[PDB]
Amino acid sequence: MLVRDWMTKDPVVVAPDTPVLEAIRLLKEKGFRRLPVMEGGRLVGLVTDKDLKDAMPLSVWEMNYLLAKLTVREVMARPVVTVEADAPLEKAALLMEERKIGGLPVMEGERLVGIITVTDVLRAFIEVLGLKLGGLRITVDIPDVPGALAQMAQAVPPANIVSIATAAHLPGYQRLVMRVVGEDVEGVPKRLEAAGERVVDVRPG
Amino acid sequence: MLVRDWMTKDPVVVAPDTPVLEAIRLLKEKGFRRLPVMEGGRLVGLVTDKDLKDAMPLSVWEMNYLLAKLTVREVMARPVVTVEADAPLEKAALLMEERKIGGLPVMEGERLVGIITVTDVLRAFIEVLGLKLGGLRITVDIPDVPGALAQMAQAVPPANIVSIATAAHLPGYQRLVMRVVGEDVEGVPKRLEAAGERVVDVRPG
Amino acid sequence: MLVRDWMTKDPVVVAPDTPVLEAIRLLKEKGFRRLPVMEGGRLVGLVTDKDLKDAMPLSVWEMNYLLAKLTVREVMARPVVTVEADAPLEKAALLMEERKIGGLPVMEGERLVGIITVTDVLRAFIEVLGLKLGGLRITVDIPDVPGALAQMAQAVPPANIVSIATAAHLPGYQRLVMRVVGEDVEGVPKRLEAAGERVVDVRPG
Amino acid sequence: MLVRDWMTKDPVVVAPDTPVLEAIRLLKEKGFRRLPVMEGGRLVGLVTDKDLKDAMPLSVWEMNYLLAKLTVREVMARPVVTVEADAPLEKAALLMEERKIGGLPVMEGERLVGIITVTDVLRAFIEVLGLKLGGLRITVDIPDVPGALAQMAQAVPPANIVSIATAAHLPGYQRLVMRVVGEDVEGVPKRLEAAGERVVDVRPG
């Protein structure tokens, strides 16, 4: 799970002296929403469609004249928050959530290699947790001692586990959301509690 | 993991006859970005800040006069895609990613109880997968036979497993990204491969 | 020559609480350019198309929202300069030129009966000076003694004089621009100087 | 009375490729309202502040982007109506009233020497008719036979006549508006009708 595997490569970039209104049209016609800003071959700022639209430099033309001449440099954000291409996917999600952002320029050190957004990170979590694989979504409470998860896992075969998440740490218990697939997945809930495990609920993957 | 646990409750709503420009200012001053549209006490449409801004009904005043009178009804989207409050968190992420959306009205049947966004879903995944718990992030390749994960898990104690994801299904092997925490977590990589497991890489949680 | 004879009757009026953008459209669709403002059945202000257009109450929508709600009261001019319907036409021209204005509400005391503009005053001067009657335009220098004009005028018959203007008061001489029409107008220049008058130049009416 | 004597010399001009919004600001900061358009050293068009403001090339930015790039060439009027510098003042008034215009580029053949407006023409009529000279404004009805005006004029001395206009051609009578000044002007009304002339009314110049 790397940023590389989910980023969009070769994004559109813009220059600081690019006129605000030109930047806007560029974002419209190429389907993007944020625009990293290059100068001297280095990343010097970042602009979103919002930033451009909410730009504030009056009558209708003093204003209109002012927007017409406002440049990207005057509205771009810095310093820009970025992630390394080779970073774990989860780092991007962390950065995005911490700082309220929906998008993130992807770097190799000083170079720009792509862009990763919130919907890219969503796709990634959807893939690696198997949210599209059907099977069964099982919430189960296991004792919160080190060896318990290994013991719970023996009930699943012949079926497979694709992902486990901790819904909650509880007094005496760790509450797992578990997705299982494959052979005789329907048998899993039985086996789990017949093996003395505490099965909270079960629905389709 | 329910939509309930991550949604923002009691969102701002608007009426179809609300003027487009009034809706915009409402979104500015209350910090939201999408606006469900209520009528007759039912959800009849949905509008984003983008929808409102990109509205197209001319000189500067014919246009200006036209925006001034354009109503929410003329630009709202339907039918609105929603999720039930009691739905698993993962359902929201699925809906958002499928349909390119960043936000989702939350319902109890016909009633409106809140709103859940992409950053809410991010927070949720960040919590349940433990991306903020430190410990160790371990990519490990285990044989892709039913019983293998149970066997791999016995190496972790005295440390705990908080979450497992499948980075990839490979020939002969399932590649897991595993986050482990607690007592002697540093010992885990040793134990894993000393137990014959195939440890791909290790970095800090 | 009265204001009455040249004014446009029953002009469009507006109220102080009329929205600026509504006033603008009203001026577009009825062909006017200034809008007297009535309240309580009295004249309380005056607005031009310029005043409305150059109105200044920001981003593009804060501005747009602001214009949308700006009222005529906030941009109207007062006190309003007016002329009485029964006033000599020349009074309007004087008021318009003194105060740079192109239009003038026409009153009967406190009541509003019409509107007179610069092009109305132009029409009037064009009519009463006969600028469309053809004939001859004669610049002539007569001595600047009281009886001279009477003496110059005897040369015109059988032709008629329609108007006389003073192009300049000169040392020893008053320089007249005179328009003559009718029978044997071509004979006038001859008769004038043959009568010892000083004929500066002659062109077609 | 020439256009020369009342025109504003050395007006601001603009080029066809001048951006509409730049032309507008130029008119604001130099106090003019129309802008002749020069190219190749010849007059190729004319633009008013209205023309520029009412320009119509959509969302708020497609529009805004479009105005930003609209050039004077796309909105200028032609062919341009002009007057020769050496033309009689009255020609300008005729052109302005005929064609609804408030301004007129002033030429010497192919060259541009100035600009004359409606308020310039007003000033001129105000000067040559003596509307600011006080004295008496006398409406008088004289018989409409060739010799009558000469005969009426003998009553004015010792006072002077500065201008005569024809308010109306009537059955049997020409109705004159006459402005008289100087010595014993108060005596004129007496003398006129005592000389059998028909004095309609009298007010201050």
The CATH number given to whatever domain includes residue C50 is 3.10.580.10
Residue C129: closest CA among D98, D151, D83, D163:
D163
Nearest to B55 among D54, D56, D59 (CB): D59
Cβ–Cβ < 8 Å for A22, D68: no
Cβ–Cβ < 8 Å for A72, A45: yes
Q: Which of A4, A161, A174, A180 to mutate to test the interface with B (most CBs of B within 10 A)?
A: A161
A88 - beta bridge partners?
A: A2
| Resolution to one decimal, Å | 2.5
Cβ–Cβ < 8 Å for A79, A42: no
Angle at CA of residue B53, ends B52 and B59, nearest 5°: 115
Phi then psi for residue D91, to 5 deg, are -65, -40
d(Cα A109, Cα A88) in Å, to the nearest integer? 15
Phi then psi for residue A12, to 5 deg, are -75, 135
Phi then psi for residue B184, to 5 deg, are 60, 35
Cβ–Cβ < 8 Å for D52, D73: no
Tell me which H or E stretch contains B98: helix B89-98
Chain centroid to CA A1: how far? 11
d(Cα B189, Cα B135) in Å, to the nearest integer? 12
User: How many Cβ atoms from other residues are within 10 Å of residue C54's Cβ?
Assistant: 16
For chain C, the first-to-last Cα distance in angstroms comes to 22
d(Cα D99, Cα D104) in Å, to the nearest integer? 11
Alpha-carbon separation of residue A5 from A112, A127, B198 (angstroms): 15, 12, 22
Phi then psi for residue A169, to 5 deg, are -90, 120
Nearest to C122 among D88, D118, D177 (CB): D118
- Tokens 């001449």 found at: A69
Both tokens of residue C58? Answer: 């920001």
Q: Which of D129, D140, D188 to mutate to test the interface with C (most CBs of C within 10 A)?
A: D129
d(Cα A21, Cα C55) in Å, to the nearest integer? 24
d(Cα A167, Cα A179) in Å, to the nearest integer? 13
Taking an 8 Å cut-off on Cβ atoms, the answer to whether C56 and A62 are in contact is yes
d(Cα B200, Cα B189) in Å, to the nearest integer? 10
* Beta pairing class for B83-84 and B103-108: parallel
* Beta pairing class for A136-143 and A198-204: antiparallel
Phi then psi for residue A30, to 5 deg, are -125, 0
Residue D140's contacts (CB-CB under 8 Å, 6 or more residues apart) are: D152, D175, D176, D178, D192, D197, D198, D199, D200
Both tokens of residue B189? Answer: 């990589």
Taking an 8 Å cut-off on Cβ atoms, the answer to whether B154 and A150 are in contact is yes
Query: For chain D, percent helix, then strand, then coil, each to nearest 5?
Result: 35, 35, 30
Residue A97's contacts (CB-CB under 8 Å, 6 or more residues apart) are: B119, B122, B123, B126
B interface with C, Cβ–Cβ below 8 Å: 21-22, 24-25, 53, 61-62, 64-65, 67-68
Both tokens of residue D204? Answer: 């201050």
Nearest to A56 among C55, C58, C67 (CB): C58
Both tokens of residue B48? Answer: 């984003």
List chain A residues with CB under 8 Å of D22. 65
Query: Which domain does C92 fall in, by range?
Result: 4-124
For chain B, the first-to-last Cα distance in angstroms comes to 22
A136 - beta bridge partners?
A: A180, A204
List chain C residues with CB under 8 Å of D165. 1, 128-129, 163
Taking an 8 Å cut-off on Cβ atoms, the answer to whether A97 and B153 are in contact is no
Q: Name subunits touching B (3+ CB pairs < 8 A).
A: A, C, D
Do you find a cis peptide bond into A171, omega within 30 degrees of 0?
A: no
Q: For residue B176, give the amino acid letter.
A: L
d(Cα A187, Cα A136) in Å, to the nearest integer? 10
Tell me which H or E stretch contains D191: helix D188-194
